[PDB]
């Protein structure tokens, strides 16, 4: 099929793939489109447009029999952490692995690194947070000694599907290629986990105080170090992208966000626990969460990939601000 | 003979415990018995209301699960890093600084600290994609899998040894026994050890010269450490113990060794029968791992720590001997 998938119309599925390395693509409709095969599809798509497959020698069969199974391994019925939500992540961090600070940077190994810890990275989600498995005596939570629980569980998964039947997407890398390629998927994977954002932050910002640059505003990264930090703050960002996207489509996410926390809340008020902050549907201001998330999280995250891109994110960030306002205009 | 093993068990707060004897005695429970004896030394049953049924319940499963098969990394070794960690506990320079729950987090710990180990390295794991690095993404993949393991048979059938400890209590042993185990991957062993050299250098002690640890940071640093100690204490023993666990290390290196050679891998180093000397390797764990370790050990308690370290140094001493040198 022309898409990876079959699609009652390949012509609009088409239309709207066109904005595939732009930001604000219109990731619900993509997954309306074909018949819920978000994650394949822009996947699919990406591959092809990076020329991935004949870099690393992937067989299309098998890139699409893993991204299948991948996309099979999100919850349907989890109402963020979904495969429209993996979709999302890896489009977007394709849109900033191509931004022109970043021109000539990364090696096709690290940009395969970095899209598929995008399109893994919160697979078999269940729904709800690391705290919230703790708290429960979860065997995940118990299997993982209660660090990172779900973000060491979607890299265990992701890894393990690549042993099912024709789905060895990395069987035609190097012994030492799907050495680092692995060693950069966890270590980007890692930190998305949110316990973890706030010394990513800090690091970053140490990054962007002595950002070496050509002429032309191209990044100069020197060695690993400084490669995976710009990869592991990109994935981030883009996993935190939804308050700087259209407004519509923040729109949507934050009624999927909110439904996944009430659904949370409502498992803490059955068992007697404490509600967790933001997962109370009876006790909730969503606009000005909204906008505490922005102010706290958000903006300060963006405002420095801005600065260490600068200018290839203005639109985001203005698109940010525009979006803030929204939800505190909106504030009951 | 049920009166030779409560003679040996007299021993139980000394360096050198013969307890490779116990185990003999005891019918291969060295764990079990060594952690009753300590929990019943240490008053821990009543501190927290552990039944004593629980407890044998608890331990002899947890002894179960220690691989007969494996040489060195077996119930053994276990009962002797418990009972080397139990004497650190008492040292002098550390009196009344710890509560009674770091006590029980620290022996817990040491009694965990390698169950279910397969006898081979994180690297042989990881090198060979093993079902436990999968698992793991290649971290701490040994000692993330003794801790859940450990925690998991409190689950079994009359083994929460920790049931009337308070939910408070309970998580925060919890924390405690994880961040001691997952520092004793020696992939650690050189940022462990650069921290606790800068925590020597400021420390700061009593009148009675007890050390100071204010906060959670500094107690814990220092309990990672002490267990850590623990388990690389076989070459601060005295030599006929010192000996048995060189022989048991290299049966169970060399057999890594031989999984490696039938691969086509790289033979790990110390992994070769063939091509490797114990003297060579005993004095080069010793100068670089061992020494360094107990040194700064030595340092941060002393002098309690003195006799111990002249046994190792007392070691290391005798085991070059027979190296040809330049003189
Ligand atoms: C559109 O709104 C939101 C979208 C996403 C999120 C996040 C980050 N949710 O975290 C749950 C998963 C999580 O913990 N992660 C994954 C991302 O990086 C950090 C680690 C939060 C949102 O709004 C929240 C804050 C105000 C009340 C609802
Ligand atoms: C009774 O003897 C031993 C007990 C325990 C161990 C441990 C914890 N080994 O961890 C491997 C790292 C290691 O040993 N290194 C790496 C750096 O250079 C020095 C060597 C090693 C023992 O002796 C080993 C070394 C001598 C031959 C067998
Ligand atoms: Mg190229
Ligand atoms: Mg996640
Ligand atoms: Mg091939
Ligand atoms: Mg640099
Ligand atoms: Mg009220
Ligand atoms: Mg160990
Ligand atoms: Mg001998
Ligand atoms: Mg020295
Ligand atoms: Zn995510
Ligand atoms: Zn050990």
């Not at 996947?43 to 690393?56: A, G, P």
């Not at 190994?109 to 979860?138: K, R």
Request: charged share 25%; proline share 3%; net charge negative.
């Amino acid at each position: 099929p022309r898409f990876g998938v079959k699609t009652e119309q390949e012509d609009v599925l088409a239309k709207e793939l066109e904005d595939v390395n732009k930001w604000g693509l219109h990731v619900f409709r993509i997954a309306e489109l074909s018949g819920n095969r978000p994650l394949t599809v822009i996947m699919h798509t990406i591959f092809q447009e990076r020329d991935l497959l004949k870099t690393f020698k992937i067989p299309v069969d098998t890139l699409i029999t893993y991204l299948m199974t991948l996309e099979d391994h999100y919850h349907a019925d989890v109402a963020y952490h979904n495969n429209i939500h993996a979709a999302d992540v890896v489009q977007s961090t394709h849109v900033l692995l191509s931004t022109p600070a970043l021109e000539a940077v990364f090696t096709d190994l690290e940009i395969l690194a970095a899209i598929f810890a995008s399109a893994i990275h919160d697979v078999d989600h269940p729904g709800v947070s690391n705290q919230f498995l703790i708290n429960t005596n979860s065997e995940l939570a118990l299997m993982y000694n209660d660090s990172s629980v779900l973000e060491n569980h979607h890299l265990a998964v992701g890894f393990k599907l690549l042993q099912e039947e024709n789905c060895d997407i990395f069987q035609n890398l190097t012994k030492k290629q799907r050495q680092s390629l692995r060693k950069m998927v966890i270590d980007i994977v890692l930190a998305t986990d949110m316990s973890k954002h706030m010394n990513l932050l800090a690091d970053l910002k140490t990054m962007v105080e002595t950002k070496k640059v050509t002429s032309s505003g191209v990044l100069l990264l020197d060695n690993y170090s400084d490669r995976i930090q710009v990869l592991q703050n990109m994935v981030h960002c883009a996993d935190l992208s939804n308050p700087t996207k259209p407004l519509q489509l923040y729109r949507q996410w934050t009624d999927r966000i909110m439904e996944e926390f009430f659904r949370q809340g409502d498992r803490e008020r059955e068992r007697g626990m404490e509600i967790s902050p933001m997962c109370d549907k009876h006790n909730a201001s969503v606009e000005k969460s909204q906008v505490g998330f922005i102010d706290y999280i958000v903006h300060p995250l963006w405002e420095t990939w801005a600065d260490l891109v600068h200018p290839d994110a203005q639109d985001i960030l203005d698109t940010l601000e525009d979006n803030r306002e929204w939800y505190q205009s909106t504030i009951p």
